[PDB]
Design a protein around this ligand. Structure first.
Ligand code: HEM
Ligand SMILES: *[C@@H]1O[C@H](CO)[C@@H](O[C@@H]2O[C@H](CO)[C@@H](O)[C@H](O)[C@H]2NC(C)=O)[C@H](O)[C@H]1NC(C)=O
Ligand SMILES: [Ca+2]
Ligand SMILES: [Ca+2]
Ligand SMILES: [Ca+2]
Ligand SMILES: [Ca+2]
Ligand SMILES: [Ca+2]
Ligand SMILES: [Ca+2]
Ligand SMILES: [Ca+2]
Ligand SMILES: [Ca+2]
Ligand SMILES: [Ca+2]
Lengths: 9, 142, 631, 141, 292, 748
């Protein structure tokens, strides 16, 4: 999955 | 550092001090002149007027303790940092006293010494005691 | 958790490291105390005898810092069980990491180097094969005494050096905090850090103990006299007379507690030495407490011959002791002259001399002076030394004293003192019983004006000084122009007064005089000397005459020793020895004969002490006249 | 802030100071120069040796300014307008130095007037000197 | 499936849902917003450890800015990339004719534990003679953590008479020395009439006179409010300007910037300090942030 | 509304008749602004509340800020309406005011005002106290001055002649300080009708309480106490019957002059005295403020204060005045010389000649504007001073400006009376005038010597001499020196004194003067001058002769002139000419005149004849005589003399005994007895021609009185020709004391 700014999966 | 002449002057004048009087007077003058210092001594009771502060027994007891600690430092003038480690830890860990309050108390102590010893408190001994109190304040800083 | 010592001089010394979370880290030195060192040592397998703190020879720290302000009471064995605020949440840095230095006790040795001997110079530590220096971060006489005490030297006089130079230098230091002063060794002084800081703007510690140069006197029969030997820590030698000066001598007698110098002598007068010879220029300013304190010049390449020894005699060379009393502070007063003991005559002996003799033997103040044979006449001779103590010095030998032909003492008058057991001087006159008179008041010295000064007035002053009756009362500043205040203007005593302050006078400060009109007195007990000839009023070759009682007279030839002529010449300021010789029959004035048999002992500097037969005026033949020539 | 009681105490104390004002000011300047050497940077042309007449004149000027302020205690900003502009703009004296000089002044007066420095009067004098300092440093920028 | 979550001190602001299920097209598709990912914004006003008192707690929005002649002032961190300060702070050591482009390259700005942040541009208020406020834009967003955190703007007016607010400051202490450690003080809001009379003489536009006990006049107008000294007679002094008047809203446990300190020259010699209302400048602030 | 429902109230005052003005209208309490508020509004207000006679009005919320609406602003009232709402105004509730401008009023019915004086010497001296609302309080001295004291004294009803400020003898009060900064002009009927500070806000303390002292002027006295006269000492004040001192807060010569003018002692010289006595202690002080200097009394100085302050670290005011020891010259037959009498206050007395030196003579001649000492003539002369004889050892040092400053050392015993008083001469004794002119600033020059007037010759008359002359006669700078008999020919004696004035000297007597033999002049040749008349504009030698001996003081007299010597007339030589000659050649005070002898050896022509000296000069060049005439002369015309021997004894029981005196420099003296040996006593009596000596004494023999000690340490060898050849040291300087003068007893 793609990353988002300042966020985790 | 203090020159041998300065150390001589400091230790010579310090012998005529009433250790059970000067401390309480200095602490009371600190509490009156700088009211926010009363915040740390809420357990001492009435502190709301100069007369109440100067007549307080707990103030005199604690000034005695403070001047005893000060005199202890006067015998270790080259190793102030280590002399005052425990007091610095106390004042930072439990009370959170700003380091400038130490300098205010030192200046008040210089004023009290001048008041008591009159014209004998010539400018050179004042400069020596300024160095001493600055050292004590820096040692207690943190 | 774990402990590790790393990169120190030995396996039991170095930086302290602790492992936590699998990563090693160092302790912050803030608050690190000898108790913390003791706890860290007892947690490890190193000797627990001595535990100093600090980084010995360790490099700068690196990595992580785990703890700060570790405080151990010493009651538990492991370092991490001690008190700390939090792990890692501190503002320390890698330049201030802690350490320890475990030791077993028989490795700490201290030695001073760079100076005259082991008891002077810089302090040089050598511990675990690493040798460094002490720093002046809290160095003074209080800590100094310990180092001198530890080395076998005495009290520490100063922090300096004189003689040798070119010491080595190392980048490791010993720091003391403060130690009260009564410790038997430096190592016992609390919280002595070894290494870690290179102290800047503080210099190295230096010492000169009393044992650096210590004087001694041996070869003499009078207590405070003989050749001078000096100890260089552990060795001895003789002192030449070429490089010794009165300023050094005054100190020599000062530290010996023999008073002050009354004579300095050269040559092997007290005996030739039988040892090594010292060569050292003494350069004392005069008021120094010890010889070591005075500066010192480096040793010269030359040496003196053994016939060049020196010697001194100080003021306190009168042996006085009390006997036949229940306590030593009450018995009769005894004295020595010419190799024989004796008992003192009380004919001229007041409460003042009792105060002084009580203070000499720590008997406190005097109480009374019994009369008669109140403690036994004694089997020894009765001595005729008239004592005139001013009552402030603390020994008999200090006081003015004279016995030259004193009157015969009646048998039962032996002096004694009962102890508790706890301001007139004659100036510029020469001698003690003559000259311009001065009194000490407003705490200042001042003289007495000349108006109304008559022979009756002069009686009181010399009864006050004990000098007998007055023979002259002089004005127009006979004995010089007095300086300072003028106090007493006119004096109208009855002639019977005991002290001058009881006379009729206008009172201190009232006067109408000038300094050109100062008064004086000459009294019967003034003495003087002279050697004269037909072609010279004053010299030191010819007949010997003595001044006494206001009149001149010749000295007796009978019972004349070799020490007498030496004393005579020394008093006249020409020579230390003399020879008798025949002379012409041309009597100059044909004066009377004053005193018959003079015999000067060893030690005195004048002729007024040397004892002899009491005065009596008589005529004498020219064959009985003493004719002396001084080389 | 200065209460009426503080102003009465200041007036009484400074009245007892009296003619010795110039001596006290010169002594305070000497104390400051001896204890805080960094303050000497603002007097480069001054002979700062012991008893220098220049220091005495400057001390008397300071004491006169303080007496003028005590007279106009209710309108101090106008009384010290020129001195405020001078120190803030022409000389650019940093505000730390003012507390130093105020402490030196209090030390001098306490040394020379033991009977007058009741703690209340001490606090009032601190307030007055703090007000003077704040006025003289307010325009500092 | 994956569920997106924002790390500590952040929060997702986009709509829909952060859960994304993998496709047979191997696309990551949230059944609400489809292909569009979320973004993580920063918490504004929730200090980790809340509350002349030494600051060893939580005033993360406080910034320290030093002019090129070594004078220290303050600034407030409004969001991750903008700060709010006093215009007079920016005009230090140059004529008031200077442009905003001449100010940005001459300032140093610290946050947290002496962490340096770079400045890109400065936006002064169009009417800074009356609303004395300015904005600082950082080159890159600051990372929100325990020591750095914005105090986002309020929605309602907390400047009620009697409200006690907290003021942090890097300015001069009782010895007129710039403080080594950050300090804070609790101050109440005073009523406008007393403050205006104290500084200007009267509330009537005419027959006003400069009566300031310190010799310098504050900017008093409808965009300002006054706060008095504390219970122990503590006040702000030089260098505290640009700091925020923070109010703790106990119903929401959020800290709100109610005012920015403008007049920091009372120093316990004047009774009141003057703060610029944030609610009166919120539109200009938002417009400048959005326009850049 | 007609005004019936409205009601007015005064709140936050000391009582119901003082406080902030409040009005109810429409159910709300409201105030009135203080714009255009004055005593008319207050009078109107203190009429409808029944509190009468409005005392004061207030502004700017003196009684605390109000609340609610503001009803009135900018009202104008006429001082006599039924209520406040009857005045003309812009409109109800219309204003540009706020609650920092509320109005207030104090009415009389409440403030039962009164005044009293307490704790002072008399019924109306002491500390002022004001009663306000039943409580007594004091007045701060800030702004308290003489006009306020005048108003207060007039109010209390006691003398307004002298009204000074200061709470004499009174202690600090207790309670309120009601008034401050009172600004009365001096004519108001009560102290509270003047302008003063608001009753509330004062920063004064009770050490500053005000007071007054009212007096008729007959109870204020001033004295100098401690010192040798009424004109020197500590200035002490006796006001009422209280004794006090003056404080030197601003003491200076300007006000010391006023004090001295008051006491009648002349002018102030020094701010100290000689402490001839002890003065008692007192606790009250007088404080002055910068007297202008031309006041006739110390009471007229503006705002002097009598008590109420301290003189800590200061001391008492003290002054010495000109009349303390003012001198006088009496008995002298010519100006600027004669016997001296000194004043100690207001009593004139003589001083023994045993206590007056040449410094004293210089200060004396300076003080009396007579010049510098020319001669001291100790011993009964210029008659006798029949009066009181002061016994004060003058110790004048330097050249003090006035005789009063000279230190003096009194004695407790009596001394010389009517035989040895002393005289003095100075260099300001010239008798000259201008005559035969239309104005006193032009005319002929005439000069009087002996007992005759004559015409002065112009032989050496010059513009400098003319300027000095017109400076003497108060005619300013000279203009020119006309020649010839421009103001008449000579008609009498023709004096020929050629003066040599430098022109910078105030009076012609101080110039060098030469008269002996001066050139003959005809009657038609006279000196004359003309001057502006506005005061504002600004070698020779004398010798004597004898065979095988020259420069001795016995033989024939001669004068050197124009490169040659010559003889002077024997005819008519008087005793005073002989005295002058001997004092010039220095061998004596005087001598005798005798005929010629065989000792002459030089036939030298005669230069002058008929020598006669006047009184006053100390040299022969200032002695009138015939003009130069180089004529041949006979021995009967030659002049021969023999001075008196300089060495004479005195106080001795007979001749050939007595202390050894000596004359030099104009005045006699003595010798010091250090090294006094029989060789000197051998020279002493042989010099008298008596015989060999027999004894010499020391330690105060033969008197210890008058004179300077011209010699000391006479190392005389015994065979000297004269006692002045000896190598005696430091001629004239007193190294020795006075108890040690010389004494000799020797065989007749
Ligand atoms: C209570 C605080 C002070 C007062 C009332 C005061 C007062 C004055 C006064 C009266 C002058 C003379 C101005 C003139 O003659 O035109 C002056 C000048 C000056 N002041 Fe201050 N002063 C204060 C504190 C200081 C301090 C703390 C400093 C520096 C550390 C300072 C530095 C100077 C200097 C350099 C001058 C110029 C002197 C000259 O040019 O001769 N002052 N001040
Ligand atoms: C005081 O001293 C003087 C000398 O200093 C003595 O005077 C001489 O005394 C002797 C005694 O025989 C006489 O021959 C001399 O003639 C005296 N000298 C003079 C100058 O007269 C004097 O005798 C001493 N006083 C006493 C009491 O002996
Ligand atoms: Ca005599
Ligand atoms: Ca006598
Ligand atoms: Ca006498
Ligand atoms: Ca108005
Ligand atoms: Ca109006
Ligand atoms: Ca006053
Ligand atoms: Ca007035
Ligand atoms: Ca003599
Ligand atoms: Ca002689």
């Amino acid at each position: 999955p793609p990353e988002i700014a300042h966020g985790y999966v | 550092h203090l020159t041998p002449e300065e150390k001589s002057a400091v230790t010579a004048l310090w012998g005529k001090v009433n250790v059970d009087e000067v401390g309480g007077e200095a602490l009371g003058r600190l509490l009156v002149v700088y009211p926010w210092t009363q915040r740390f001594f809420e357990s001492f009771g009435d502190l709301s007027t100069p007369d109440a502060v100067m007549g307080n027994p707990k103030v005199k007891a604690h000034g005695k303790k403070v001047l005893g600690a000060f005199s202890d430092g006067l015998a270790h003038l080259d190793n102030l940092k280590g002399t005052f480690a425990t007091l610095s830890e106390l004042h930072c860990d439990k009370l959170h006293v700003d380091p400038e309050n130490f300098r205010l108390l030192g200046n008040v102590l210089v004023c009290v010494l001048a008041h008591h010893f009159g014209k004998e408190f010539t400018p050179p001994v004042q400069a020596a005691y300024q160095k001493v109190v600055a050292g004590v304040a820096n040692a207690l800083a943190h | 958790l774990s402990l590790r010592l790393v990169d120190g001089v030995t396996e039991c010394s170095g930086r302290l490291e602790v492992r936590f979370q699998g990563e090693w880290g160092t302790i912050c030195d803030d608050g690190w105390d000898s108790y913390d060192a003791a706890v860290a040592c007892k947690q490890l397998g190193c000797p627990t005898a001595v535990t100093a703190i600090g980084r010995v020879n360790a490099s700068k720290g690196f990595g992580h810092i785990w703890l700060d302000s570790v405080s151990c009471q010493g009651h538990e064995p492991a370092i991490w069980q001690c008190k700390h605020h939090e792990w890692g949440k501190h503002y320390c840095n890698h330049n201030e990491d802690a350490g320890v230095t475990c030791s077993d006790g028989s490795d700490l040795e201290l030695r001073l180097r760079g100076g005259g001997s082991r008891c002077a110079g810089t302090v040089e530590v050598e511990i675990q094969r690493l040798l460094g220096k002490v720093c002046d971060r809290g160095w003074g006489l209080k800590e100094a005494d310990v180092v001198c005490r530890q080395l076998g030297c005495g009290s520490a006089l100063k922090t300096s050096y004189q003689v040798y130079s070119k010491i080595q230098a190392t980048n490791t230091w010993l720091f003391l905090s403060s130690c009260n002063g009564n410790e038997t060794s430096l190592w016992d002084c609390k919280n002595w850090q070894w290494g870690g800081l290179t102290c800047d703007h503080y210099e190295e510690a230096k010492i000169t103990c009393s044992a650096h140069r210590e004087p001694r006197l041996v070869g003499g029969d009078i207590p405070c006299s003989g050749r001078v030997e000096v100890k260089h820590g552990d060795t001895w030698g003789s002192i030449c007379d070429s490089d010794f000066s009165l300023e050094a001598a005054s100190v020599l007698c000062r530290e010996l507690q023999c008073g002050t110098v009354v004579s300095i002598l050269g040559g092997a007068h007290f005996g030739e030495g039988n040892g090594q010879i010292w060569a050292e220029e003494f350069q004392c300013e005069g008021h120094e407490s010890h010889l070591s304190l005075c500066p010192v010049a480096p040793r010269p390449e030359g040496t003196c011959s053994h016939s060049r020894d020196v010697g001194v005699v100080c003021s306190r060379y009168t042996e006085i002791r009390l006997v036949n009393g229940k306590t030593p502070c009450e018995g009769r007063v005894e004295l020595k002259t010419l190799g024989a003991w004796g008992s003192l005559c009380n004919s001229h002996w007041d409460i003042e001399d009792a105060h002084v003799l009580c203070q000499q033997l720590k008997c406190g103040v005097a109480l009374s002076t019994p009369g008669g044979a109140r403690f036994g006449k004694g089997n020894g001779q009765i001595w005729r030394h008239m004592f005139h103590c001013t009552g402030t010095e603390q020994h008999m030998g200090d006081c003015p004293v004279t016995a030259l032909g004193a009157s015969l003492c009646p048998s039962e008058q032996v002096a004694s003192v009962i102890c508790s057991g706890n301001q007139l001087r004659l100036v510029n006159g020469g001698g003690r019983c003559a000259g311009r008179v001065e009194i000490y008041h407003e705490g200042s010295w001042g003289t007495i004006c000349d108006d109304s000064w008559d022979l009756s007035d002069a009686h009181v002053v010399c009864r006050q000084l004990g000098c007998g009756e007055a023979i002259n009362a002089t004005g127009s500043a006979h004995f010089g122009e007095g300086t300072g205040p003028i106090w007493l203007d006119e004096m109208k005593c009855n002639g019977k007064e005991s002290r001058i302050w009881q006379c009729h006078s206008h009172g201190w400060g009232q006067q109408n005089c000038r300094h050109k009109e100062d008064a004086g007195v000459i009294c019967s007990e003034f003495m003087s000397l002279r050697l004269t000839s037909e072609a010279s009023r004053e010299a030191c070759a010819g007949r010997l005459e003595v001044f006494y009682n206001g009149a001149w007279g010749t000295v007796g030839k009978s019972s004349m020793s070799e020490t007498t002529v030496g004393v005579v010449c020394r008093q006249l300021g020409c020579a230390d020895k003399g020879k008798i010789n025949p002379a012409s029959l041309d009597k100059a004035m044909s004066i009377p004969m004053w005193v018959d048999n003079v015999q000067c002992p060893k030690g005195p500097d004048t002729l007024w002490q040397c004892p002899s037969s009491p005065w009596e005026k008589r005529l004498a033949s020219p064959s009985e006249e003493t004719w002396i020539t001084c080389d | 802030v200065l209460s009426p009681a503080d102003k009465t105490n200041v007036k009484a104390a400074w009245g007892k100071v009296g003619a010795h004002a110039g001596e006290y000011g010169a002594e305070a300047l000497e104390r400051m120069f001896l204890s805080f050497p960094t303050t000497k940077t603002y007097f480069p042309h001054f002979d700062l040796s012991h008893g220098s007449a220049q220091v005495k004149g400057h001390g008397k000027k300071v004491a006169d300014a303080l007496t003028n302020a005590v007279a106009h205690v209710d309108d101090m900003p106008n009384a010290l307008s020129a001195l405020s502009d001078l120190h803030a703009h022409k000389l650019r004296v940093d505000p730390v130095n003012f507390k130093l000089l105020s402490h030196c002044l209090l030390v001098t007066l306490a040394a020379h007037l033991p009977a007058e420095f009741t703690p209340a009067v001490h606090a009032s004098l601190d307030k007055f000197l703090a007000s003077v300092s704040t006025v003289l440093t307010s325009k500092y920028r």
